[PDB]
Write a protein that holds these residues in place. Structure first.
Motif, PDB file in Angstrom:
ATOM      1  N   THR A  74       0.828  -1.203   0.000  1.00  8.76           N
ATOM      2  CA  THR A  74       0.000   0.000   0.000  1.00  8.76           C
ATOM      3  C   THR A  74       0.864   1.256   0.000  1.00  8.76           C
ATOM      4  O   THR A  74       0.546   2.240  -0.676  1.00  8.76           O
ATOM      5  CB  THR A  74      -0.945  -0.008   1.205  1.00  8.76           C
ATOM      6  N   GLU A  78      -7.299   3.543   5.117  1.00 16.17           N
ATOM      7  CA  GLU A  78      -6.416   3.628   3.960  1.00 16.17           C
ATOM      8  C   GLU A  78      -7.064   4.363   2.794  1.00 16.17           C
ATOM      9  O   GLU A  78      -6.353   4.943   1.965  1.00 16.17           O
ATOM     10  CB  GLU A  78      -5.988   2.223   3.531  1.00 16.17           C
ATOM     11  N   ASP A  99      -5.661  -1.899  -5.544  1.00 18.12           N
ATOM     12  CA  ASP A  99      -5.217  -2.462  -4.274  1.00 18.12           C
ATOM     13  C   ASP A  99      -6.392  -3.077  -3.515  1.00 18.12           C
ATOM     14  O   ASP A  99      -7.174  -2.361  -2.890  1.00 18.12           O
ATOM     15  CB  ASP A  99      -4.543  -1.389  -3.420  1.00 18.12           C
TER      16      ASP A  99
HETATM   17 MG   LIG Z   1      -2.010  -3.085   1.894  1.00 16.65          MG
END
Ligand SMILES: [Mg+2]
Ligand code: BEF
Lengths: 381, 402
Positions: free
Chosen positions: B172, B202, B252
RNA sequence: UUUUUUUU
């Protein structure tokens, strides 16, 4: 001709439409006018008993330009899937040639299943260029004959592509007579286009994005087309990359049997890929079917070891390529010891066999890198 | 006056404006319904054609899902402009007696010139030939990741790469370093960030970190939402590529998206060892869209692949996508446990046909560098590489030393 | 589908 007009660009074509008075619709409009006309393709018999002349550009996939084929027409010329047909026509009116020959000679022929199989008798010898190193070491490490059923096993990044492209280049360079068609299964879209451009012959591919059933349908179309040409006493050569991904495609399609071999392979998954690869054979009646398919090993996948070890008991020729050599950046990256060909004494002469036998004995104690280094220097001088 | 611009504005400015001429969603609607009676309204969103034939313009804040602010699109406009799912539309709308009367722009272009265009499937795929250097040259600490990336695995237009690594290895963080380098070095490229089935902290961070379009779907959302969001993003990408635009999607992750499909797809006739057969093809269509167009434009996709998680399902997803990507950037957990960032596995990292992305001398000096690093371990290799690059501000000055 | 097989 339907095929030639499909290849013709719209810029040149539209001018003709003006003189005569979507490309697939503009073409169908020009085709209908002349009727007040020919086409071709590869036959595929459906379940109704009917047929469709698939097109190689569409990778033998169900297309609209396919030519309908009547069952009665199959009954007359004993036609089966894989036959090449060219005639005036969409519906097939009449046929002019079946497998590049007169249809009357196709009616009387020995079926591929009845052809007497034999070990590769004739030899497929493989300029002094640097690319010839891989081909010259190939003749020494593992000879290839007509109907040879061999593999090109190697780790990833080793150069499975460079070896097949080098073989194909040598096939059309020394054996233009042999029918060469390259099959790509689960292949990358950038690698397939590159293939089509540097190889001399037909290229049937199936991108990784395609479903597993597509990979199976394509492969069986090419392998059946080869069987028909062998029935006409022609020498066919198929280059596949890879037989490993094709086996995974069959493992995805095969109905779950409840039993799973080591590596995650279904117990009934490797039968069909064994017939595809086992179709390659040498025939005394005339012609042959050669198949050189790459095998994936040392990939970190246990499934690929079971596949390789299974097809090894199916084939009769193997050319290993070392990763430790690819790291050293030297080529050709060939594991001489692991390589070998069954019944090699038939393809090579007595003198050639003795010189090859004494050579292997000297390389056997040597290491993988030191062996190839000594061979590359001996061939360079 | 604008629908999307009226729901984007706060309630305080919305209520005060409404008094001159209750829930916010009805405040904006009431302001639009009264503004229509004054004789004066415009809307916008991404098109989604339903199975029935008609489509609705999905909003970005709704993550391209059904919303009370979505605009109806009659089948007529779909035939007039040959509209397909993923087309961004902007025109004047009206309240229901919402619906669109006339479109003013399709895919940021004039409707007339957009009607006739070459399809995305007809575009011819090639190897990436235009290099996308990641190192910003700022000298910042983050540039170390981009510099090591350029030396280990070059990226180009139409690239189809994978950031393979164990959990908590810095994948990430890798995409964060990429998105920053894409906006700093190549602001011309269209940047979309797709976060599928991941942590909600995130997505908020990704939105504030990089400038662009961040489309996400946290793990709070069903697996059915993960797919639909990814379907809308990829189709929008294909439409932009048809305008010869250089699109770059940072996904992702690809593993999480592949798991969402397996849960959504109707039970396949066969179940592979457990992941379904037809379930893995759908992610291959999304990930396979990445390609370099000969006609013009490109579609770059850099998704993160998860490994060594103790899950067979994750190892199967990786095996099916292993030989798919032409670019691979591996990260090691042992380097991450030693807190040595970027925790990259230089030996396993590399790209296909990289001689088209780097100059002759560059490719040679990169090969010399990989030969020296090859014998070293993965931890010794990275600490060695970071040290040599620390002496320098830019990769180029590091090259000349050799 | 689970268990068995995959699988150690
Ligand atoms: Mg990740
Ligand atoms: F847990 Be990491 F984001 F794979």
């Amino acid at each position: 001709n339907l095929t030639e007009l499909k290849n013709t660009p719209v810029s040149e074509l539209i001018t003709l439409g003006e003189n005569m008075g979507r490309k697939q619709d503009i073409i169908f409009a020009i085709l209908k006018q002349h009727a007040k006309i020919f086409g071709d393709g590869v036959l595929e018999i459906l379940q109704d008993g009917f047929g469709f002349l698939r097109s190689a550009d569409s990778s033998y996939l169900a297309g609209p330009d396919d030519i309908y084929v009547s069952p009665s027409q199959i009954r007359r010329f004993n036609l089966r899937t894989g036959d090449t047909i060219s005639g005036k026509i969409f519906a097939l009116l009449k046929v002019n040639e079946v497998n590049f020959d007169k249809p009357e000679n196709a009616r009387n022929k020995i079926l591929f299943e009845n052809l007497t199989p034999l070990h590769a008798n004739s030899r497929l010898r493989m300029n002094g260029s640097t690319e010839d190193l891989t081909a010259r070491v190939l003749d020494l490490a593992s000879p290839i004959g007509r109907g040879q059923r061999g593999l090109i096993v190697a780790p990833p990044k080793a150069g499975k592509t460079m070896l097949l492209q080098n073989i194909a280049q040598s096939i059309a360079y020394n054996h233009p007579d042999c029918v060469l068609m390259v099959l790509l299964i689960d292949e990358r879209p950038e690698e397939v286009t590159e293939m089509q451009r540097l190889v001399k012959g037909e290229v049937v591919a199936s991108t990784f994005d395609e479903p597993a059933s597509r990979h199976v349908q394509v492969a069986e179309m090419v392998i059946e087309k080869a069987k028909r040409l062998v029935e006409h006493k022609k020498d066919v050569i198929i280059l596949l990359d890879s037989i490993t991904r094709l086996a995974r495609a069959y493992n995805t399609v095969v109905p779950a049997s409840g039993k799973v071999l080591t590596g995650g392979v279904d117990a009934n998954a490797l039968h069909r890929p064994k017939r595809f690869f086992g179709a390659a054979r040498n025939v005394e009646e005339g012609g042959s079917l050669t198949i050189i398919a790459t095998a994936l090993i040392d990939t970190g996948s246990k499934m690929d070891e079971v596949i390789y070890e299974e097809f090894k008991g199916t084939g009769n020729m193997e050319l290993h390529l070392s990763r430790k050599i690819a790291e050293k950046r030297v080529f050709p990256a060939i594991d001489y010891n692991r390589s070998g060909t069954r019944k090699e004494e038939l393809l090579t002469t007595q003198e050639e066999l003795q010189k090859m036998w004494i050579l292997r004995k000297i390389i056997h104690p040597m290491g993988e890198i030191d062996a190839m280094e000594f061979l590359i220097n001996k061939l360079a001088m």
